[PDB]
Ligand SMILES: [N-]=[N+]=NCCCC[C@H](N)C(=O)O
C-alpha cells in the first residue's frame with residue numbers, strides 16, 4: 237500500500253562496474269524485491285553520472301564526443317547490472333533534458349531564496365590547453381622530499397600532503413605546460429544556512445547510528461559554503477545567465493535521480509506521480525542506498541538543496557561499507573580488483589548475491605568477499621541445504637508418483653514452524669538485517685534436512701509396500717523447499733525462477749500459508765551446481 241522510491245548511487249561514466257558497485261546495487265535490489273513481494277508500489281531508480289572534467293578529457297583522448305563515450309559506457313553498465321538481475325524500473329543519465337531542467341529549476345529557486353553566493357577564487361590554470369586544473373590534473377616535484385612526478389595534493393614517496401600550488405616545477409597533466417594561478421568567479425551554495433535543520437535531522441533517530449556520529453564530526457568542524465560552479469571548457473550543464481559557467485557535476489548528480497524518475501513518469505504517460513513523490517506534502521517514501529564515501533553529499537548538501545528549492549527530503553539514507561576481497565582492499569596486482577563483467581564469465585549472479593546478503597547488516601561495516609569462504613558457503617548453503625531439499629526428493633515424486641505431491645502434509649506441525657518464521661524473516665529483510673534473515677532461513681533449512689534424515693527416504697524407497705510413506709516424506713520436503721525459496725526470492729532471482737518452474741507455481745509471500753497438495757510438479761535438469769577453487773583461481777588470473 238506504500239509508495240516507495242529507492243535509488244542507488246549513480247556510477248561514473250568513465251569507469252567499468254566492479255564488485256564495489258555490485259555490493260550496493262545488490263543490497264538495494266534485495267530490499268526492493270522484498271518490498272514488491274509485500275505488495276507495495278516501488279520505483280527503483282538509478283542513472284549514469286555522466287558529467288565532469290575527467291569525462292570531458294577522456295573523450296578528447298579517445299577522439300570521440302563525450303556524448304558518444306557516455307552512451308557506450310551507459311550501455312556497458314546496464315548490461316552488467318542486468319546480468320546481476322538488478323531490477324531497476326528506470327536507468328537514465330544525468331546528461332538528459334529532464335536533469336537539465338530540474339537542475340536549472342533547483343538552482344533558480346535556490347538563487348531566488350538567497351542561498352547562492354558569488355565569490356572570486358584563485359586556481360591553477362593551464363594557459364596552453366586553456367582550462368582550470370582540478371588538483372589531480374597537476375603534477376610536479378614534492379616540495380618536501382623533492383621526488384618527481386607526484387600528482388595532486390600528496391606525495392606517494394614520502395607521504396606528505398600539500399596544496400598543488402606548493403609543487404615544484406608544476407606541470408599540467410593535460411598538456412605538460414606550466415600552470416599559473418588565475419582568478420575566476422564562482423557560485424557557492426549556502427549550506428551553513430541549513431545547519432539547524434540538518435542537525436535536527438541527525439538527532440531524529442532515522443539515520444544509522446554510525447552515520448549520525450559522523451555527521452556530528454562534520455558539524456563540529458563547521459559547515460562551509462559549497463563551490464558549485466566550474467568554468468568552461470566543461471562537459472555538463474551551463475548555468476543560466478552566466479556565460480562560460482557550468483554546474484559542478486556533484487550539484488546535478490543527485491538531481492539526476494529526480495530526472496530519472498521524471499523520465500520514467502513521462503515515458504509512462506503518468507502526469508501525477510512525479511509531484512506525488514517529490515512535492516513537500518508527499519506521503520511517499522524516499523530512500524537512497526549509498527556508500528560511506530559520499531555521505532557528505534547526500535546527508536548535508538542534498539537535503540539542504542531540496543529544502544531550499546521546495547522539494548521533499550529523503551525519508552532515510554541506507555549506508556554500506558567498502559567491499560574487500562580476502563580481507564583487504566581490492567588489489568589489481570593480486571587480481572582481486574574484479575569487474576562485474578569478469579565475474580559473470582566465471583560464476584552466476586546468484587552466488588555473489590547470496591554471499592553479500594549473508595554478510596550484510598544494518599551497519600556501515602565493510603563486507604569481505606573471502607574467496608575460499610565463498611566456495612564453501614555457496615556449496616554448503618545453496619547446494620547442500622536449500623536446493624538439496626528439492627533435489628533429494630523430486631526424483632521419487634516424478635518416477636514413482638507421476639510427479640504428483642501428497643494430498644496432505646506429513647508433518648503439519650513442522651510446516652507451521654516454517655510459516656511462523658515469516659514475520660521475523662520479513663522484519664529482517666525490512667530492517668536490512670540481511671545476515672540475520674539468512675541465518676534464520678538456513679536454520680530452518682537445517683531443520684528441514686534433519687526431518688528428511690529422520691524419515692530416511694533412501695531406506696523407505698527400498699522397502700515393500702511403503703510407497704505411501706515415500707510420497708509423504710518427499711512431498712513434505714518439497715513443501716519445506718517451497719517456503720525456503722519464498723524467503724530467499726529477493727536474494728536469488730534466477731534460482732527462484734527455476735524453482736517456480738519446478739513447482740509449477742509463482743512464489744508469493746502469503747502463498748506459503750497454502751501448501752502444495754495433490755499438486756503436479758515438473759522434472760528438472762539441475763537447480764544449482766557446486767563451484768570450486770579452480771574456478772576462483774581462474775577468476776583471479778583473469779582479473780590480473
Ligand atoms: N545517490 N546519489 N546521488 C548521486 C551520486 C553520485 C555518485 C558518484 N558518481 C560516485 O561514483 O561517487
Ligand SMILES: [Zn+2]
Nearest residue numbers: 378381391394
Ligand atoms: Zn615527498
